[PDB]
Amino acid sequence: AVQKMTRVRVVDNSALGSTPYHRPPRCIHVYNKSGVGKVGDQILLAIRGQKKKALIVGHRMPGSRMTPKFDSNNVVLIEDNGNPVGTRIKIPIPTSLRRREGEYSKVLAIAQNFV
Amino acid sequence: APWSREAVLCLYRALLRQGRELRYTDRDFYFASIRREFRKNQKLENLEAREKQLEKGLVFLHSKLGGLI
Amino acid sequence: HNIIYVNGSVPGHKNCLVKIKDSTLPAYKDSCKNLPFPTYFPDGDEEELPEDLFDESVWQPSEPSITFA
């Protein structure tokens, strides 16, 4: 459950998410009518003095049975047009992104591993 | 540098040979793309670097051309 | 055992008496058309009912594992 001011991990190969500038990116906004962000929910990110959109692909909060609970809050950086900023994702991504309402096919194309 | 430079030639021959029968994929593009892959990487490499590059190409040959149809 | 399986929660604690009657919602206005109109009489026994009656969507136990084919 990502909220405002939560520290999140950029699970991507994009330059902005690299370990330099150790300060973790923090959530500024959750694009939901509730402010709670779950898997598949977009958020606005404070990263390296920039404001960038990100998509939640994993979090530590328990979900419904038969679904993966991760050890970190993961996100992928998204361009304003909606194209992913990074070109590869190596960490496992839950398969539930496929069905839920939204535009997630672009991200799934980038990720080899699904869990 | 490679496991054997003849194996590099053998790998390229098979890839073109396998691509000859592709129908759904754009045969012309596949031939051009393979040329770019071979030229960009293989021109300059070391023993370890070339071995890894050749190994990935070998997987492509034995994996039904990486699922290409 | 005369057990009804009802979706969701019912007011009250376990072992408490409840009142159950056909739904008064407009969508299910006339459902008694295909139900025992006064009531179900075991005395008539036109056809002895199975021990368990199921809804079509319900996946019965002892069925094969659900594969979304």
Binding site: - | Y12, R13, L16, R35, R39, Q42 | -
Partner: protein
């Protein structure tokens, strides 16, 4: 068979190939040195040569041809 047919056809298929510039497309045109073609390039020349005539041979001497007349001669004795 048309031995000269192979020469012109080899000359023609090589002429069709666009990457090589037919600055000197003689019957004795070398590939490693005269045309500056690498091991990668010649194989594709084999495919173009093979495609026209129908292959039926391995790379045993296709690599060794190194010139149109040699392959023409090699295509000359295989048919």
């Amino acid at each position: 068979l048309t031995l000269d047919g192979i020469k012109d056809r080899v000359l023609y298929v090589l002429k069709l190939y666009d990457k090589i510039d037919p600055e000197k497309l003689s019957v004795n045109s070398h590939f490693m040195k005269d045309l500056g073609l690498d091991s990668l390039d010649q194989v594709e020349i084999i495919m173009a040569m093979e495609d026209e005539f129908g292959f039926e041979i391995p790379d045993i001497d296709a690599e060794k041809l190194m010139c149109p007349q040699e392959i023409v001669d090699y295509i000359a004795d295989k048919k």
